[PDB]
Amino acid sequence: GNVYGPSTGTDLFISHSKGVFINGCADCAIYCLPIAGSAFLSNCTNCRVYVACHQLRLKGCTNLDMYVWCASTPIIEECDAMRFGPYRCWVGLLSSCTEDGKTYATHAEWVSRVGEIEDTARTEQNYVKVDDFQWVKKRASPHWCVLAREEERASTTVFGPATLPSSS
């Protein structure tokens, strides 16, 4: 369970692990190698985040663009101005490597082999459905939406060096 942040204005590189917690980051891009477990973000604002994971939960976040490959539906809580896109927008992952130097040619391979999500076909599109569970009114939640094609930020950024966790 690696803990990262708080941090402002510096791009973060989160290596593969079985769980991450990201607290109090602002005004940056966050590039995560696939996490074979849950990712929890709290109190983050104005960040662009690229993450693959088994579960994704966000609390107290505002103006996050989330590029996500998740085995389950992402959950938000006390969040607003959230926009969701696919992990494949991190084009630079494909020119990156694992800690052991392994490289894969597609995002599905990365997510299957490093993320340990076996059913890549069924999960890729989980980012279009978000569970804003405290919004119990009948109408769609106004707190999140899906990024339009032209608003996708297709990052060519290569991973590394890994950001050192604050704790574990």
Numbering used by the authors: 158 to 325
Paper passage:
A recombinant form of this domain, comprising residues 152–355 with a Leu223Met mutation was prepared (LmTBCC-C) to allow the production of selenomethionine (SeMet) derivative protein. The strategy behind the mutation was to enhance the chances of obtaining a good anomalous dispersion signal by placement of selenium into the hydrophobic core of the protein fold at a position unlikely to influence the structure. Two polypeptides constitute the asymmetric unit and in each there are two segments, residues 155–157 and 326–355, which could not be modeled due to disorder. Although previously predicted to consist of two domains the structure is best described as a single domain dominated by a right-handed β-helix of five turns that form a triangular prism. The rest of the polypeptide is catalogued as the TBCC domain but it forms an extended structure, not at all domain-like, mainly positioned over one side of the β-helix, the C-face. There are numerous interactions involving hydrogen bonds and van der Waals forces formed between residues in this extended segment and those on the β-helix, including a tyrosine “ladder” composed of Tyr188, Tyr207 and Tyr224, to stabilize the fold. The structure of the LmTBCC-C domain matches to the human retinitis pigmentosa 2 (RP2) protein with an r.m.s.d. of 2.3 Å and a sequence identity of about 25% over 139 residues. A comparison of the structures is instructive such that we are able to identify, with some confidence, the β-helix A face on LmTBCC-C as the region for interaction with GTP and by implication β-tubulin. In particular LmTBCC Arg214 and Glu234 correspond to RP2 Arg118 and Glu138.
Tubulin-binding cofactor C stimulates GTPase activity and contributes to the release of the heterodimeric α/β-tubulin from a super-complex of tubulin monomers and two ancillary cofactors. There are five TBCs, termed A–E. TBCB and E bind α-tubulin whilst A and D interact with β-tubulin, to deliver each tubulin subunit into a super-complex comprising the α/β-tubulin heterodimer and cofactors D and E. TBCC is involved in the final stage activation of GTP hydrolysis by β-tubulin, promoting release of the α/β-tubulin heterodimer from the super-complex protein assembly that can then proceed to polymerization. This TBCC cofactor is a polypeptide of about 340 amino acids, located in the centrosome and predicted to form three distinct domains.
